[model samples]
Target chain A: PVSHPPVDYHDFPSLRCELGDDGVLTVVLDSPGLNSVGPQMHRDLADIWPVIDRDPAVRAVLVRGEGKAFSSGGSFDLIDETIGDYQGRVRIMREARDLVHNMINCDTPVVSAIRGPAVGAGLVVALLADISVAGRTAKLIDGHTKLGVAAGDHAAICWPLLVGMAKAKYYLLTCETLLGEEAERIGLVSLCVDDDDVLSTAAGIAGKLAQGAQHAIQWTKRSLNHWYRMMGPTFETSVGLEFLSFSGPDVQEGLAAHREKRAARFT
Target chain B: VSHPPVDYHDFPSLRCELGDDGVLTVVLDSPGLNSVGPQMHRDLADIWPVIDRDPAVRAVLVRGEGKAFSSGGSFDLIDETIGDYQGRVRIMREARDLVHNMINCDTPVVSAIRGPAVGAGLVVALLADISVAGRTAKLIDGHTKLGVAAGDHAAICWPLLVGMAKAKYYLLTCETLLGEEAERIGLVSLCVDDDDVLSTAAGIAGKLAQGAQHAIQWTKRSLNHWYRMMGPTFETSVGLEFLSFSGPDVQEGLAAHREKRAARFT
Candidate 1:
């Protein structure tokens, strides 16, 4: 029998202990605009993975955001931090990579019960979940290319693997908002149901996976994941290129345009 | 020095030859509308892995029909065999599985050069190669749900790796033609000029082989191949299902479709 890790609290999120079944349901509690991941939010997510791994009772995880949005990705302040400060750029890049790899490599199966808007870092968690359930109206976007990044992190690595190349190219290039139904149709998410059913659907899948044959499922998962491992090089290349692009002129314009809430004029 | 095996000669639809540099060039030789495959073709392809390992060949290959087309997938006769005979169906399924696995497992690298019409079984060869080339008018098609048996192999795979759902829908539903312009846009593989440049292209294969046997080329190939492996379960399931659809109902439907006539399935 494993013991729970000592609880640590953060300002940006809310953590709840579900009844003895030992599930840690973390909700992004930022309201109004919901939660948008900034430096502090990223730090919280970075800390949560190890804690989830160590907690013996915590067999599964369910992540969602309060209010109308999940996350709008990086805040303008963080984007400023990347442009003006070298150390900040490097640190944020590492965080972005860590967010993706940690979610995928984590032993515990994670679920994202998404509704409203799921974009940026929130979209990362939504797509990375071992099983994901989205409300039919949920708006999912990668937004990296739109932000002048190379659509890095999980999109290049996982999207083509899940959805196929043609579809992957269309969304990545266009940065088109995929409605939940279309997402499921193209194999982006595991299930898309009514908004009311999103949490229950996710919880049910996670609970079943948590209780089922642990070794067999985990081993099978590990074996099947060799495919992702094979794409390791491609992911590394894409991520590196994405970071390199941040130093270019287009990203500078992209960041400024977003801050001013105006269309970017790329040179 | 290892000698070349007779496995190449045994293939009915393909011509195999050992190049001066010990590269094995497997040419798809059915002329005009190269639509042919049978038990012997399956046997030849199934044995390629052993030959690849044993022969002194540094690379294995696939190229199109004479000056024009490569072999189209299964012809009407092969589809008929699949519909009426269990053994033919089993052989084709095995062939499809073998083509994908053999391409992955072969120690030597593979290359594909597309000329005029590169369709059917030949398309599998085109995609399986480590590098693919398309001369000007290389019209390619998966042609599975075009009212025929999804024989000639690719229905089990291809779309999920290259274009994903968009590619799958295009290939499965519509008989959309993939030309050099479109193929390159999709990043299906590399595209080159339409001139007579076999030697120049073969030189490229030699360059890939000589660079780094395991470290550079193979590793790059293997890493990019993760999506294809992830799609194995889906491929296996769909291949079996596609074959099961090949009986009287599908046969007549396919015939009607080929004749540009309405299919009345009973």
Candidate 2:
């Protein structure tokens, strides 16, 4: 049998996976209220890619949020630990890097249904999916530069691939937040529909992708991903620079300002 | 020597003119629709290094003679490429160097394209930093239809200009897209009327020449690193495309193209 052997869906805790009889696996972010990516969630997201590839039963994967917000960004606890705890900071950075490569390398076609706030790790999934459906009200922000970090993670790899270098530099440098409609217009999202239809639209895409020829679709995706693989060095440099900034004074003020809900006065 | 002398008329088959404003105008003028034969291709590859070193040239404007930008390679060249091994390698090296030379050239290139644009000619047309196309311009890769990989600048620049979805669709299917659609999809920078194409390109070149030279040249170098990083993939694509010449399908592709009919590619 040349087909992949299926894996147990219960392997991942942070992502609530429900395998449909039709072979589409719906993976939803389980955290309530803003869907902050805690340490466990970060690890889970990174580790889930192998299972996504190994499972023959899951023909396509639809990733979305359980609650109103897709994700508010990284957890305050994790950020505080990253500021002080040396081991924890390095750990999450590895996980962060893994999340992008794994998602891109996964053989199964992944689709994203984004609504409400999408930032940080969650925003990574939303933008890096094979196809992404965003609600009209979806608010997408990178916020790395504003947080006194380099626009790392998927910024270098995916942003230039989605939009041109000129626009990507402007948005990443300014830490600008864009709505779903604007994102679609700029070729960030595949589709922008009414707020209520985001998941349905994603499901529609996932379903069609699932029914298509497996090797042909998968090979097409793999070939197209060569573009991202080419930018691998740029991504590594940006990601390293981002974590390096975490050890600096500007990031301290950056963290303080976000918590205090005020302007950051950086030196 | 103060700096390398700038002689625009060094290469044969290419018309060159330098204006008072430091904008060097290079025209691809050849017999039969400006089709790039062996001599024309050699000139295209060889001129860039000269342009890069010449301090007198601030900006460059490239345009086609006759009606078409270029109708790809002349049949004699294509036939030689398929039948002879040394000729194939020589042309492939020229093709590879053409892309790198254009990317590494210090002077900002602005291409004005109209009518038919395809194959190696399309590579020059699209790889320009600021490409101006006529609204009625027809741009096609036709590499796959010609029984080869969508190589040349396709792997290096297409996915960066337009998104992956559009790049894959057009490359895999070998579809011809109108210039207006190309601009809409961000494949080309600007699309003007067929009558206004040359004027618009000349204007852009003039403005760029008059601007701060150091800043423009530096910016061009930095942006080109993105293409430089994809060196491995670009090399692989070109290698495979040349290798395809040893196959039977490309022969059919050439025969069909010469016969003025749809290619029945197997």
Candidate 3:
């Protein structure tokens, strides 16, 4: 039989702890309004992978953003911090890379339950999950180009691999938002459930994975991961270029445009 | 000044040697419509990295199939051989892996120029190249669900890197044919004129390779490539899973579909 779920702790920016079932660990990003991945949240997310691995009781993980949105991506404040401080930009870039890579490389199977808007770095992790479950209403967008940056982070590598180069290019360049059901149809996410069932469905899938044959599943996952590994050079190149662009003039305009709530006229 | 354009020794296929100058080589796949990574082509493509690293070479060397089509992916003959023989499937799988790994690992720049139809093992090499070229008439398809398997190629990795999940799901499942116009829209690569310009445009890839290695080219390329490599696990998982699907169950389905009849399972 399964163990009872543990008490859920309420962290200020995000909530974390083992679920009652000794198998699933749920992380809720509970920041007010559309939950965005700020610096602290990035740090928290980066830490969870290792901690989850160390916990013998945790078999799988379920991540969801609390409130109306799963994650609105990079908060305006963080973008400002990136522009004002060079060191801060570098630190965040590193953290961003860690966030994308760790979620992918982590041995544990992860399920992202998304609803409303999923954008920015938060959306990065959402797409990187082993099994991504989005509610029909989930609005997914990689707004890098819109913010005057290259479609960096996960898009350069994962998007094309998930879809195709042709499709990857258009969406990355345009920064179009894909509804959850459409995303599922396109193969972006694994499943698209009703808004009501989003959390429960993800939890159920996580539970099944946690309880199944650990070795076989893990090994299969590892072997399958080789495909992504083969494209390592491509991904590294894209992320590095994205960071390089952050130092360019366009990103400044992007940040400014976002702050002023105006369209950025990229030179 | 410049060396005379390489002679067209064989019909359809074009060959050129590289010592100091970067050259783009197009492999003609017409006539019998051979597969891109067919035994000989696979050997040549596998050695591209070493060619790129050669001190005599400064930049890019491109490879594309000629004549009837470009890649057409894996050939039916090879697929049939694999279905009857386990060893063949394993060997093809290795070749497929090699094509993807070699392209990713190669330091020198590469590109692909496609004409008419490109499919099968050839699609692996086409996408692996740093850049790809297409003509108006170029018809491209992954063809994984066509018959044999997605092995010896890029079914698992291509969709994720190029478009979005929606596009990937559509192309992979439907095996739809993509034209040069559509290919360019999706950012597959630069699509050029279908006339004499096809060859001329492909030759320009050599110029990109010859330019300053550092300044903005190589560094920019290296940085952008990181994103591609990030999803390696997802790519590998899908590739392997695709291979698994090519077993008896899938093969029967393919045959039944081809013959316009229902497949009977044992």
Candidate 4:
């Protein structure tokens, strides 16, 4: 008999997780305000990947937002609080890196059911999922440049691989919002479902993956993600730049503009 | 790290010239519009290891001597391999080595693709880190039409560049893609005027030669891992493709080529 370490799901208060009989873990972003990644949730998201990886029962995972929106993005207060705090910036940057690295390294196949708005850290999980099922109404946005930061959190490495360099640059540079159908057309996500079927479709995909050829599917994902492992420096540098931008002037104006509901007059 | 010395004289089909800027121009000089026949195929397989080891070569610029990048695999070469077990085996090994060596080669490669690029020629053209094609250049992988699996670079690179959707459509149908359409579909890195292909490729090679060597080389190593991971799938396709040479359809396919007509495979 094989021995496995005990993994406690209770450790992450921000996420509601349920492990199915089929070994499919459905994780819900249960935080307040459109499932935004506030301080606790950010830590939770980073920590959860490794936990699920180690959990022997989890053959696959399906992550989705609790409500209509996947996530409203990073909380305004968290961004406001990080300014001028050097150690805090470094810590947050490490967490962000951990989130991406851990997720990529995790052996279990992941499926994301995305609907409404998916941006910032939330968009990271959505896009990084091996199979991303987005609803037709889902709006996928990389708001890094709009927030006066380099597009990090899985953008630099996977974006170009997903949608080619031209489209990756255009969308990341302009911070354009991509609807699910258009995103599907450009090969951003695996597939786009009707708004009602997003979770069902993702769950179905997850169950199918979980049930069939476990080793083959797992090894295939591990092999493919070596591409991401190769782009480690690029992703790290982008994340570093993103954190550095927190200490700069533009992000402050970015936050202010968001709160004030106006276009940022960035310096 | 010291590497074994490589002599360019070994590869007669390829003309290698190193510029002062460290750009090694590897011109495909094989007979018949640079077709990758038996000799050229062997040369393509062996040349990259030499370039990878050569300290003087900071970057590589691969192009044909004249108009087309390549007329693809020669009809004679195809006919010779058809129904010949040993010939197919030898060619398959060379084909595998060509792709693996190019992927593992430390120096960045830039290809100036003009006119027709198919089969082994298309392999070299697309495998380069940066591929610049002439606007009117016609690129196709006629493997299926030749009664073989879309082998060589198709399974490994096509999906990564233009996505599986487009990759399947073209590789299966063997549809011709113009350089302009190829660029639009993200098949090639850049598309330029037909006349400017060499100039644009040379300029890019010069820039790469002068750029941070380790950074550029490392980036190539990292990105090529995508292709490396698909090694099993690619090898399977290569095996299937070569195995088809002994099958009945390839004879008909080759016969159609010799007769200048479409294959009527039963």
Candidate 4 per-residue C-alpha lDDT over A109-166 given as tens digits, one digit per residue, 9 for 90 to 100: 9999998889989999999999999999899998876666656677877876987744
In angstroms, the error of model 4 at B80 is 2.6
User: Which pairs in model 1 have colliding backbones?
Assistant: A164-B163, A164-B164, A165-B163, A165-B164, A166-B163, B65-B69, B73-B120, B73-B121
Worst 10 residues of 3 chain B by lDDT: B211-220
**B149-228 in candidate 1: lDDT tens per residue?**
34444544455545555556655664444445444444343455655335544764554344223222232333334435
Docking class of 3: incorrect
Position A169, candidate 4: lDDT: 44
Instruction: Report model 1's TM-score to 2 decimal places.
Output: 0.55
lDDT of 3 by residue, B1-266 (tens): 55343232322233445534555343444334545444444444455455444444544444444534454534454455445556455555655545555445434444454454454434433444344444554544534454433443344444444445534664556444444544544435445555443454345444444433332233334433543444464356445645655467656655665587756645
DockQ each candidate and list the results. 0.08, 0.11, 0.13, 0.06
- For each candidate, what is the lDDT? 0.60, 0.82, 0.59, 0.83
- Measured with C-alpha atoms, the lDDT of residue A2 in candidate 4 is 84
Give candidate 2's fnat, 2 decimals: 0.12
Predicted candidate 2 versus true structure: per-residue lDDT over A30-65, tens digit per residue = 775489888888889888987778876777889988
Which has the higher DockQ value, candidate number 1 or candidate number 2?
2
| Candidate 1 C-alpha lDDT tens digits along A1-267 | 856557444432633334335454444436334576677777666556766665666766777777666667767776778777889888887887777767666776677888878877778878887788989999988776566666666675687667655456445544668899888876789899998888778778877777877667667766666666666666766666666666767677767777799965553
Q: Kindly indicate the candidate among 1 and 4 with the higher lDDT.
A: 4
RMSD per model, one decimal: 12.9, 7.0, 11.2, 9.7
**Chain A TM-score (model 4):** 0.97
User: Model 2 off-target regions past 4 Å?
Assistant: A1-41, A50-90, A104-116, A130-135, A143-152, A156-176, A184-267, B1-61, B64-91, B104-109, B136-150, B155-189, B202-233, B240-266
- Which of the numbered candidates is closest to the native, going by highest TM-score? 2
The ten-residue window of minimal lDDT in model 4 chain B covers B211-220
